[PDB]
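Hi R.,

Here are the chain sequences for the assembly we discussed:
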Amino acid sequence: CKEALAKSEMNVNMKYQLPNFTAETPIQNVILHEHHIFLGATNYIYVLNEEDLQKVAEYKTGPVLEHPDCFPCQDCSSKANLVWKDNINMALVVDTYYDDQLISCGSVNRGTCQRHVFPHNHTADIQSEVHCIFSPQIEEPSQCPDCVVSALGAKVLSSVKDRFINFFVGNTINSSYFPDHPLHSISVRRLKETKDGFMFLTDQSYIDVLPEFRDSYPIKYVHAFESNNFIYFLTVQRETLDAQTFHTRIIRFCSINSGLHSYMEMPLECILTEKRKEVFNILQAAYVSKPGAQLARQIGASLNDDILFGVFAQSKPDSAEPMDRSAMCAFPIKYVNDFFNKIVNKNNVRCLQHFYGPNHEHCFNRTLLRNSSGCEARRDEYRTEFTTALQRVDLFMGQFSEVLLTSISTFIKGDLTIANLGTSEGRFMQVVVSRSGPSTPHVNFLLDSHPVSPEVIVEHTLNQNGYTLVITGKKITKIPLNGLGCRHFQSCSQCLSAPPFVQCGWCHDKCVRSEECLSGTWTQQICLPAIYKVFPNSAPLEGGTRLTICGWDFGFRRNNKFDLKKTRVLLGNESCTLTLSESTMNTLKCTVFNMSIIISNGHGTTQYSTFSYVDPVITSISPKYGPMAGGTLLTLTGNYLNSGNSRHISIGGKTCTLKSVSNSILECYTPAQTISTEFAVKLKIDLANRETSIFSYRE
Amino acid sequence: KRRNTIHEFKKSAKTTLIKIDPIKTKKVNTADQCANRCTRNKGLPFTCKAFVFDKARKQCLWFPFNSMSSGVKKEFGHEFDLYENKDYIRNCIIGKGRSYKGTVSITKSGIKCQPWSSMIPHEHSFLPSSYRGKDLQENYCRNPRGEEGGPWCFTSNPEVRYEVCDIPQCSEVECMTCNGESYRGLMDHTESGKICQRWDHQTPHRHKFLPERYPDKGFDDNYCRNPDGQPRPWCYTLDPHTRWEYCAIKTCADTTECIQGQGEGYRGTVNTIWNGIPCQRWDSQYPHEHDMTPENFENYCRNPDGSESPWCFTTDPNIRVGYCSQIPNCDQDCYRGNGKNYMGNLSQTRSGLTCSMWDKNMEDLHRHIFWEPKLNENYCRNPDDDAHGPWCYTGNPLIPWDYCPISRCVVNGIPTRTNIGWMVSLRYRNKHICGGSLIKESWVLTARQCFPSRDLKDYEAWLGIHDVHGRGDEKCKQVLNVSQLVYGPEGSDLVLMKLARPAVLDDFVSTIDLPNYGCTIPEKTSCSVYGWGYTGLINYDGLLRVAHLYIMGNEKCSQHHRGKVTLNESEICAGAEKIGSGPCEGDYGGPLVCEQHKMRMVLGVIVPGRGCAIPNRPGIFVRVAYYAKWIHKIILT
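And here is the predicted structure of the full complex:
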């Protein structure tokens, strides 16, 4: 039996009270700074304590009244007419290069942002200072400089380059709203020292789709980061202007204050390939971090070589949504940089579809000096679109291929690395990552109905004090990365599979920390076999029948595998038969006066005192007379008739249809025979041949 | 019914045809429907040998002639696309060759074919009127009935009536290589005689390969390709029921340790994975059968499918694929500011140019400078022990030498009473942006952060003005184009401009002397800065505005920054007199000038950073003396 022992695996649901805070409105972004965590949520902003998990203060960008004549920060309080919209923060950043500043951004106010200051004595007040970054472009009102945040999609990266604050923003915008307000899909806003506006340094400082396709070609930006003086963007789009399919891409460009000079895009796919193929199209979340040492060997990198981890989900047929099927895939920065620079040949390179246009003179007769130029800024830049994609394999080998992962974060501990997966339902988990094999989730509990937001914050001071901040629906939670407990482990195998940093050990009854054994028998090296049930408990020393053994921890404890060859089963001196095909670490099969059974796995042994030496016997039948057609119930009696699995009761080679079998009474109906005389009945318990009282036919 | 036959046509991109001595256009949405019309019998009264469509035109036009027809002009028209009938191009036999249009009119016996219009010497020549659209030409032999024998014609020879023309099959010319992907030929027929559907189409198979998405692999109309690395090319079947079929082609006739690429072309006798588990041979399917076979292309770690790493099936049955990741793939100074200490194996410059011929380099260096009486030709090593790092001479006539990139360890403005010619107003887009300092008759310096553009035909220099655009003195203002700009050393963030023509000196305009290279500044030394830029006033009349500045050391700046900045010898700190006043936007590249005793001289350059003049907070400027020797070296040009 397998389901009867469902107590084997870790109890997937057990409730914990974590440091948590509830929001009145959905939360969009999160920022940590100086033991203060800032939460931009629907129309609101909050400040939260790092340890206390208490709202220090809050401020409202509440329900927004809009007037067509009204400008984003011009006074409009006296307006008695109008829309009643709601601002939500897609772009939130803390900057410290100039001063301790928060740049927040609302969705409705023409995508205009606001600036807030902190006093030194009190580094948490935000209502003290409010500052619109709203510079009237009297020079060229054709382009709105401070109109930055697109209401449809926004991804913002702030950085400090050449002693200026630079904002690389990728904005998804529909063609409908373009004439209302001119925006650019990808732009670089550089901060004025006066902190009152931005300047577009040149025309080539921005790149955006040609107007005709601004309805088609949906480009949604999902991540951005910086490495090796490059700004990378992970974003989804169609395969081509015609495909209507979807696939994600990496975008790199050189961060010169002027604008994007060397603009490259390359398509990324992650595939589950087996011997003698599932491709994940849509990226769900991403996170770049330093790798684990074992992972450093497994991927060929150093402890400082930065690796990007992406959650990829297969797209719906000609649609951007997934089928709730997700995987995690790793990409070293060195390999992707080299693929961009050297590996791809010349003729595969193409011109940008949405920017250049197929019927235009550049990619007619323009080429690249790929091998002889890298990040070089030339005024007649050539925007490139590689057609050769980069493929990688899921390191989990599809351990989550049936479920969707909504978010992901990573951290490391000694030689190993642990990923903080977030499930579409909101089932946060932590799992050790390794190419060795699938990893059991040492924590799997369900948090909330709402999905886990892609906004996730990690922190680990001193490699001792660690915790992650996770948003979900209207609640944020601080989950320490030091584990929660060892009690939930319900098998020695599961208990020992736990990472060393959580002190898990079987205390002869259940897994627990070392100090918590009253009995002092804490163990972390051996798995004593445990018997759940035996089917059945009676067999002769020669009688042989199918024997099912339900239990746990039968297999030899190896690092990942659990072998059955390193196990013996004995009926005292006699050894019970081993059927390794039907015998597992969980279940076993044998086919052989109360007696005990000793099962010795690769580490320990256990005795089961229920087996008995009996033999079925027969006393009488009823009745003795029956017609030619048969069909007569034989109230067969005896003892040990319920030992062993099966009984064959037949007369003249034709089965007496068995209706009921018990230890004391047996019943069968005779079939229609061919002669009418005095015959006996034959019983089989698969080895114990037994004859009974003769039964006479009539006609 | 309603059928499709463009799958039998060819296709060309961005082309159109014009016959000088000739054909009708109709508005049709689908060019495929037009091609079907052209094939469909009686559809066009003429013999539609080709078709042309333009999506922009949405116009459909058939040509009764091929591209091979004499007197036609090909025009490279992006919007127009050509669809040619491959039968005239086939020049071979498929099956019975029912629709054969070959321009062959000879028999195996070499007697000329009897014309199909003249019924002598044999009278079975009513077929030109019997069968419409079958394209039996004046004399060329066809298969009007699609008879199994092939193209047969009547002989003008009397004794023999008709004989089948010997015309080759199509498999004769199309050979095959083991890889298959390299092959790109003319077969468009599957192994069972089916025809490959249009790779541009999406019906009746909604496959994955998109020819524009995946170019470079011959994803043409219907010609067989090997995209998935099969031993043979295959194509999706025109039949909706048959998913895809292979293409029958006869075969053609007539290693290291380091890793190149991802191991595709690489072969290696090593077959041990990082786990150390070896791998079995390709013949031995043990433990679990592997699809790949040697006939498709030992027990080594190869890459038949061209994955990221070569993979060989581990002897362990549980692991299907193991990757030998231990393979190696074929793929700077500190505290030594003098390049003589390190032998830099670098033939490149910071700008990316290669070096020059070191013989003439040594000759010119010795002639120019005789500092001291070795190194290798064309390398990062330098003889002069330059503090800014190793460098190398360059062959560029404009610049003969460049550094080799190896890592080694006004707010509250008071207007000026008079005008000073040391300032240069950076004019781009016909307006001031930044301030520059005049060193020579043809040399200015400013900050690197004042150049949105890397070109020069847009910038402009305006000199000798007391106002923003010289609103006062139009009599003496001067305009000069920029001839060259040069970026400073690593982290210097300074640029040197030589103008299109040196400006003759005058009382107003002034060139400025340079600091002593080893000089140091005393604390609190008052100096002056000049600017046209932002001042915070309600109205900037554009007049030159002056401010006074005072030196402070690393400390008071650092506590004023509260540890924000860790200062360096490349930097000079100086702040105001506890009042709110300092450089801001529009003043970048402005000069800080000071005197030893009487002769005033530039010590600093206004650089953007850390806000505009926060009261009681000193500003940071470059050390001009940190580069004075380098400027003296570059002045040789």
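The first strand of chain A starts at residue 20 and ends at 22. Chain A touches chain B at residues 97-99, 162-164, 192-195, 201-202, 205, 239-240, 242-243, 257-258, 273-276, 297-298, 300, 338, 343, 347-348, 350, 359, 373, 376-379, 387, 391-392, 561 (CB under 8 Å).

Let me know if anything looks off.

Best,
T.
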